[PDB]
Each structure stands twice: as C-alpha cells, then as structure tokens.
Amino acid sequence: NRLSVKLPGLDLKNPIIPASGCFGFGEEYAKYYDLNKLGSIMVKATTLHPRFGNPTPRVAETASGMLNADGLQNPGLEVIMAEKLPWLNENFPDLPIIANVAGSEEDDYVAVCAKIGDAPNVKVIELNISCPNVKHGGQAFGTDPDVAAALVKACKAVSKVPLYVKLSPNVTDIVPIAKAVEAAGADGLTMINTLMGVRFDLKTRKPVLANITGGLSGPAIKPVALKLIHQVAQVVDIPIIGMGGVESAQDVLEMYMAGASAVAVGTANFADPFVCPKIIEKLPEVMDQYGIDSLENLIQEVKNSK
Amino acid sequence: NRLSVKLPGLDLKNPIIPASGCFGFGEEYAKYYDLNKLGSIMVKATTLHPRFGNPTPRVAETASGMLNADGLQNPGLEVIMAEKLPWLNENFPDLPIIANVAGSEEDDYVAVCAKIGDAPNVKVIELNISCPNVKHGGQAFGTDPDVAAALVKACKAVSKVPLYVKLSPNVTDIVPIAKAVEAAGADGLTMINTLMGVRFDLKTRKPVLANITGGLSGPAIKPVALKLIHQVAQVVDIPIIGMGGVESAQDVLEMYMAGASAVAVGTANFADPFVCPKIIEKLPEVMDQYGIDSLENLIQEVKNSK
Amino acid sequence: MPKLQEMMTIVSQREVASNIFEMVLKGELVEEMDLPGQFLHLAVPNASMLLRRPISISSWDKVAKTCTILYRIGDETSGTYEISKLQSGAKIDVMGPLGNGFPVDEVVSTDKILIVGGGIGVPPLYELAKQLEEKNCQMTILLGFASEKVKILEKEFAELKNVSLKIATDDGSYGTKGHVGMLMEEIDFEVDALYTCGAPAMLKAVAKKYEQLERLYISMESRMACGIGACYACVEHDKEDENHALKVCEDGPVFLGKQLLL
Amino acid sequence: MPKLQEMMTIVSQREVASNIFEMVLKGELVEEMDLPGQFLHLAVPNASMLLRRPISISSWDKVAKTCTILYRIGDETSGTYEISKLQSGAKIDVMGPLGNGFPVDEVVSTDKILIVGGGIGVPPLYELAKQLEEKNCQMTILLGFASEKVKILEKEFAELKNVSLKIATDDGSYGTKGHVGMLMEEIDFEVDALYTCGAPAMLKAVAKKYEQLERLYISMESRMACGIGACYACVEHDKEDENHALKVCEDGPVFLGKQLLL
C-alpha cells in the first residue's frame, strides 16, 4: 500500500519498527496488540554470551526524555537462537526481524553474525557499534572509522543476511564513520543510538544511575537525530532507518524529510504501549494533510531533493 | 551570604548568571526587574566587527527545548565598548559583567580580548570557541585541543581580566580539549554551549531554520550538560560555570553535584522572564530541603567527593 | 507599576471558524492596553513546549477587564491546539501587552482610512477600526480569506458605522472571488493612511501599490522566542538604514512602509 | 477481552497526610483486579515527564467500579506533585493492573497471618487484609512510620475484625517509639504466612527474622520504565537461580523470600 516500503532484506507492510532494547523480543508487547501490525522489530541486543547487565538503578527520567544504562542485558546467542527467535517465528512467521548484534571484541561480533542469520525470521542484522572495545582501550567501535570499517568487513564476511550498522551520535564528525562503513560493505544504516547523560540525586549527591552515565533517548533527542540523519544522507547512497524521539506520524514524516526510509520507535513505547499501531493507523490521514501519496515516492522525491 | 560564591574575577552575591545570547546586554530584561538581583551577566557575544547574523527563520521549538541559529548578531566591539557596556556600568555599576568573545580567526579573538577588559564593569572574558575557523577549513576552534590551546594562550597574552573558556558538547571526547585549555592558562571554564539539531517543515519538506542546522538548548540538554560537566570536573582544577537546561533551584543544585561553582541560565528566560530572580529567592528553601548550609561549602564538599 | 505578566482567566473560548478559536481573557493586563496592534506572548499548557505563542490582541474592554483574541490552531501536535483545550475558568500564562501598535492619535475626521486584512492578520484590525470610529473618520475595510470556511469577524466589522466593508475569498465561496489585492486595485479615492496585516504576499502587494504613501502601517509576523527584543530571533532588515536590524517583537510588530523591504 | 489501559476518572482526591494523597479512580480496569498487591502505571499530566509512575492499588470496589491509591508526592518539580493537582472529574492515563500480587487462595481460617508494613509500602496491604478477613483468619498487623505526620490508613485497618493492630513511629509522635522491626522481635506465636511491604531496611529485617519461613511474601520497589517486562529496568538477582534476573514489574512486585537477596 502507501505505507509499504522495500529495503535490503525487508519488504515491509509499513515502516514502523520498535527500536532495539525497547521491545524485548516481543513477548510482552504482544499481550497488547497483534505484532503483525508492525513492519518489523529490532529485538534486544544479542551478545555471544549471556549478560546480566549493569546494576540498578538503571533508568531515570529527564525533560522529554529518559536515561538508561541496562548494559545490554540479554540471554546470549544460544538461548536467543533456541527460544527468543523461534517464539517470534512460530507466533509471527511473516514478521521480519532485525537482530541487533553487540559485542566486546571483534571475534564476538563475528561469531554472532555467522550464526544468527540461520534463524528463518531474521532478515537483517543491525550491527551495534556503540560498544566498548576491550582490544582498543574501551573505545566504542563506532567512534573510529578504521576500527568500524574493519568490524563491518569482518562481520560482512559471515552474514547470510544484509548487514545494517547503527551509528552513535557521540562523535565530533559522523561523516567519516558513515562513509567508511558503507565502503566496508554495509547494506544500510540505522541512526541514531543514544546520547550520553547524567542525573544527580540531590539528597545523596551521587548519580541516579549506578553506571553514573546513561543513554539519553526520547523526543528530547529528535532534533539531534534529524541533524545527523540529514547530514549522513548527503554522503551515502545506502538507505537509513531513522530513530530518536519518534512519537507521532508527524515525527515519522519528518524522519523522511531528513532522508530516512523507515522509522524505528523506542522510548515512546514506555509511555504508550499502543504508540506503534496508533502511528501506523494515523499515517495515511497525516500524509493526506501534507499531500504525500506514498512513502516509497516520498523517499525518491527526497533522495532527488537531493 | 549562603548564596555568595567567589570565582576568579567574580565576587558574586549569588551564582545565577543569565547565559550569553539569552539576555542581550540587559536592556530589555531590566524592564522586568532590578538586574542587581543577578550575580552576574553573560552578555551577547562580541565580535570585532558588526554582524547582522543569519537569515530568518532563526528559531524553532523542540520537545523541552529550542533550536537557534542567529549567527552571533552583535553591533561589534566599538559599539559594545561605547554603548552597551557603559549603559550597564551606569545603571548597574556594581554588577560584574562577563563578556562573551567570539571570532572567525585568531587575530579577531585577540583584538577583542585586548580591548574589552578596559570596560570597568567587565570582570571576566568568556572565550566562545564554538566558532568556525576560516584559517582551518571551517573547524570550530573548540574541537581540536591544539587549535584551542593556541587560541587561549594568544588571548591570554592580552587580557587584563581572567579568561574563561566556553566548551562545546559536540565532541567525541571533551577531556583533551579541557586539559589543553587549562594548560594554556584558562582561569576557568563554562559549559556547555548548544548541541546541534534540525527541524523539518512537513509542508515545504525543507528545514525550518534558514541555516538548516541550529543550536539545541533547554531542559532537553541538561542530562548531556551534567554528564560533560561531571566528566570535566574530574580532570581540571579550575572552576566551572555550568549551564544547559537550567530552570529551577533544583537544577542549580544538581549543577553543583556535577562540579559547577556557579550556574548560567539561558533558554528559561524566554518562557519565564522572572526565572532568574525566582530561582535566586527559592534557592535557600531548596537548600534547606537537602541540608546544604552554603553554596561555598557545597563546592568544597563536592570537590573533595571528589 | 506595569504588570508585564499575568495568569489571566479565560472567560470563554469557542470555535468561530474552521480551526479558529475566539478566547476572552480577563485580567489586569487589559488596563495597560492602548494602541491597537499590540500582542500577547502565550505559554502553551504543555511543559515540553517552552516558547510562548505570539497572538494579536483583537479587541478589549477596559471596564470588563477583558481582552479578546482570535487564533488559528495547528494539528494535534501543535501548541495552539493545546491552548484550545483550555476551558472557561482556566488560567493562561500571559506576558504583555507587547510591541509597537498601530498609531491613531494623528487620525482626524477629515481623513479617509483604508484597511487591508487577510487570514489571521485580521483580528488586530478590529480594535483598530473600533478606535478609529470614535475619530469620526470614514473607513473602507477590505478583508480576504482562503475560504468561507475561515472567514472571521465579518459581523463585528459590519456593525461599525462609517465603514464600507468588502470581503473576498480565494475560492469564491463568499463575497468576491479572488484575493484582497484585487479589491485594492479598484480603490477610487485618495487614502491618507493605510493599515494592513496579513500574509506576506498580500503585505507585498499593498506596499507596492502605496509605496509613495507615508502613513502606511504594516503589521509583521515572525518566528519569536524571548518576545521582548533580547534574543534577536525576529529580525527584519531596516530598509531606510542598511547595516541595521529591526526586531519585529519590539520595534514592531507594526512598521512604516518605508522601514520595510517587500 | 482485558482492557490493559484506560483513561480513568478521578472520583476524588484529598491530602490525607503530609504530602500523601488518596485518589479514587473509576473505570473498567477495576473489573480485572484480583490479587492484592498489583499496581497501576500512571502517566503524569506533564508532557515533559514521559515515564509512568508505578503506584500500588490500595483497595477496590468492584460494584462501585472504583479503586483507591495512596501516594506520596515530591517537590514542585516532581511528577507525583503534578498528579496531585488533578481535580475531581479529571481523567488520568492508567495502564493496569500489573504484576504478580499477594496470593491469598491457600490461606485458611486456622492460619495466623502476620503483616508488616512501613511508610508508603502500607497502601497495598489494606486490600490484602480486606481479603484475608473473609477467610476468617486471625491477623496481626504491624505498621511503622517516620512520624505521626505521615501515618496513613490506621482507621481503615482498625475497622477490620480479626485484626490486632500495633503502630510505631520512629520519633514516638504516635503509638510505639521506634521501627516496626522492634514490634516484630516481640512476636509470640508461630506465623504461617507473612506479607510485608516497605522500605528496604525493613524488608531486610523481616527477611532475616523469618528466613526459614516459606510462605513469606515480600513486595519490592524499583525504578521502572516500560512497566511490563520488556525494557529490563527493574531487575533483581534471583537468589535461588544465580545466572537469572527477576523483573520487579512482571515477576513481582511480590516475591517469595527465598527468591530474594536481602
């Protein structure tokens, strides 16, 4: 239909995708609506081994946003291949799944990328490079173009599905990293991951988060997301799934004006569990309001804008 | 009193300072209350020559924030020495003024720093290094530690008043820049300047701002500000005037927990013209609530926290 | 002595045209109002929307302690939309009144006044005509709208004596089909003062047809932040003084035609 | 068939103790309530505060279609403060009811039940006692507070038959001076099931004194985000299964004492 969009590895009925780490592996939000309404799902990060994650408190509220520092808690590859992904395949066999892949060192990233494409419902791997690198001094794989390009090319060597890369906003210049990752064979990009923030408790005078720092998400970060998506779209020809503060069909369309081809929705699910289906159903009315016939056309019109 | 705080060049009756670019040179907000209530004022940026600034639209609203791209509109050094600063000296001779200094190339920064200390009410120069450098490819003087250290040391050579440096949050790692600038002789720091954001108009499909990108300010950016202030405070021994999203006496105290010694207040003035005096008067009640006797003690307790 | 800011009380609020609400506000800010064409800087009742909404004062009643505004709302993500949910009895956070308004002191019974309004530029012109009626002068008032669906204040203007009122709609749904500028071109007298407020293309047409008139007052709009002249968000180039910036919120919103470029 | 979310109507709301409000909510969500100790996930009426506030259900009335909550507010920057400004007739955005509550099915008239509450952990224990009273069992209920200034629900608990109620205050302003844990140490019978909810130090004391009891139910609190088990914000370590994380919002909020570490 009008909402349908086609991306490498993804023939989506609509462009609305719950963002990784905000939907689990679907089992809880499924209690609230038929997940088939979604275009896709970015499931919680997969690491090679299980991770309990960071100590609590893990979250904090901010003005039009939140902080989070769960630390990529997940049951690990085996359990995700055996339990989490099969449950989604059984209950929603036609719903394509984007597997968010994280790690502490390159070998770990590669091992997950070799295996997780085997799951039939997994159509795309989302490479999360905002992770501290224990072979590089704790350096997030995504702040250095050469590190990032190496990681991408290595994982590209073993993926049986198209490989997207999730870019971090915490850089002086995102253009070198984006260029390098496309050159290393990335089929697409997703952006953005969280900003870094801190809250202090006035009584204890200590940080609210046990991790001290946390990732800043929510509508507060949408202007930064649009800036970086727009910046990157002028510099690469692979498509972009945009995210950061999306809350409404208006926000979705604004993501398109920036150069995104589909839109992920994260923090909004916590305020409103129905936000993703609500956005999906109000998209055609809102597209009418601004004279947009189809999302596929809008992508090409904007791509030629240019 | 309890609110009094002493910084290089600043014996402040309280730590509340309207942020540069959000108070003009005081003449308009003075219509609403006695500016003597303030601790200080960061006046609009001074460049060597007049600047009309960027085309309109210059501002846009965001979730718990705003975008702004005025482009450092100011009447230039001569007019600011002859009109703007003397008016503040006549009407508020005891109110210390922080002169925000910007420029396109180092010689321009130096020339302003040589002259503006002559004004009797100017007690501190706030070096704004978030400016595009036309001798470096448009590179903001504040994203490269060596560029920044050179600029600071050059301006340090001619300033008759203590020199503070305003740091930009748009960097991968703010610690090298902060270290280098302290080493170059900076008496103090102020942080943070704005993040970069973009809004799109859904009807025109073009950016809302004529400049496309704009600076993102307001409560939305407070978690990022606290993160960077906290990060820098562990790495330098010169004091910090913290700013970014401050709206309440609570926010002021939270800035102190991060390591600030005084707090600038910017975007909040546009929503509430009385916000700075309101914060000043509710600070003692709020300090009571969290068992803080004086702001000077709190600074030392936090500095030893460490 | 001036109040500057006040939590006013909304007396009533009703949708008088498609997505256009008329709100009556009661407060002590009304006692400070003088020139037509000043504005109020309204805080949206939504804590994620920090910039005030600038809205023209359409009329006031000093005895009633009330003022009246008419504003168009956006979609459900807009702040004006939030404002329209406020009910009779609610408080609204007002700064004002603000700006340089339309001057009327030098208007006298001999003069023939022309008024050109369009869209949501129309509200402030009502208090203008209301005041000029006391000076026993003869006014022609030309108002244009996109559609009958958004026509406003026809009845209020019609009940004013010494007023010829012609109304255009772009689609022809009401009155004359076309734009106000057309009804301008048909003017057959010597106008001594012209007051105009509306969409940029209309303001441009008026400014060329009467470029040689000196008493030509143009009410401008702009994106705004501080609303008081501090932040420099709302600058126009000064036509008579290149190398100088006019601030719509504080120098205006009303300017002499010679001060403006298109 | 389950509603999951509902714009409930606040029936009333009044400050029943220093910064503690009792709100009555009317909606179809009440028909889905069963176990005591479930909670509601409340949206703050402030668009800059996006995380819902988790608040225990204190009591409900299926015929009235009402539930009752008692919550403490923070300062004027807190969201609970905003919630307390809601007036009779306003709507409030509720998700719920949520979580694993206190089980009562296996309680029988023979059993002697102990209940230990503190502070704002007390509200959910009221609906618990209310339900246990029907099972004709004999309860001792020990409640502790910082001060008389924050004592809540004494009268409601007192009007319950089969209930011995002792009340402590840390300062001695009311009842027994000291903490609940002291009144625990004085227990002189064999308790078959203990239900407790309150501040961590208190939960810890209860958990040691009755570490050997199996029917020991502890209601936990945590920072929360999604409120349904998706986001992993609210994890406790599983004591009986190291290498496993319990989620307070979905596995709890009520746990068996053997599942918890301190």
Ligand SMILES: Cc1cc2nc3c(=O)[nH]c(=O)nc-3n(C[C@H](O)[C@H](O)[C@H](O)COP(=O)(O)OP(=O)(O)OC[C@H]3O[C@@H](n4cnc5c(N)ncnc54)[C@H](O)[C@@H]3O)c2cc1C
């Ligand atoms: C001096 C002055 C007087 C005005 N008088 C009236 C009046 O009497 N009636 C009326 O309907 N409108 C009037 N306007 C226009 C009115 O301020 C805007 O229509 C309104 O602010 C749009 O906000 P929103 O909440 O609908 O949209 P949002 O999209 O939620 O607003 C986003 C931001 O953009 C700003 N903005 C967007 N469009 C405009 C615009 N066209 N002009 C100014 N700011 C804008 C908003 O103030 C806000 O800061 C006036 C504008 C000015 C400058």
Ligand SMILES: Cc1cc2nc3c(=O)[nH]c(=O)nc-3n(C[C@H](O)[C@H](O)[C@H](O)COP(=O)(O)OP(=O)(O)OC[C@H]3O[C@@H](n4cnc5c(N)ncnc54)[C@H](O)[C@@H]3O)c2cc1C
């Ligand atoms: C399962 C459960 C049931 C609860 N039942 C009750 C009850 O019946 N009565 C009652 O008074 N309180 C109860 N609480 C505690 C209540 O949720 C917090 O006191 C409240 O969320 C604090 O928010 P605020 O608006 O006052 O402060 P703000 O500082 O504005 O909140 C900031 C953020 O921190 C969170 N937060 C801060 N302190 C706490 C805390 N102690 N627990 C959980 N979240 C916190 C808030 O939810 C919000 O996300 C319960 C908590 C949980 C987890």
Ligand SMILES: Cc1cc2nc3c(=O)[nH]c(=O)nc-3n(C[C@H](O)[C@H](O)[C@H](O)COP(=O)(O)O)c2cc1C
């Ligand atoms: C609780 C939480 C957990 C997250 N976990 C992950 C993750 O595991 N992997 C990942 O790539 N991004 C993760 N993110 C980032 C989001 O997917 C998204 O990139 C970011 O939050 C911005 O989108 P939003 O503002 O719509 O939430 C997480 C965000 C939150 C709030």
Ligand SMILES: Cc1cc2nc3c(=O)[nH]c(=O)nc-3n(C[C@H](O)[C@H](O)[C@H](O)COP(=O)(O)O)c2cc1C
């Ligand atoms: C309209 C506007 C103009 C500004 N102008 C300047 C400036 O001229 N020089 C400068 O160093 N910072 C400037 N800033 C940045 C603010 O001083 C402050 O560093 C930033 O806005 C964050 O604080 P806030 O969130 O409290 O506004 C400006 C900000 C705004 C919104």
Ligand code: FES
């Ligand atoms: S709005 Fe700030 S100067 Fe006009």
Ligand code: FES
């Ligand atoms: S709050 Fe999200 S998992 Fe418990």
Ligand SMILES: [Cl-]
């Ligand atoms: Cl791992």
Ligand SMILES: [Cl-]
């Ligand atoms: Cl210059």
Ligand SMILES: [Cl-]
């Ligand atoms: Cl009256």
Ligand SMILES: [Cl-]
């Ligand atoms: Cl009923």
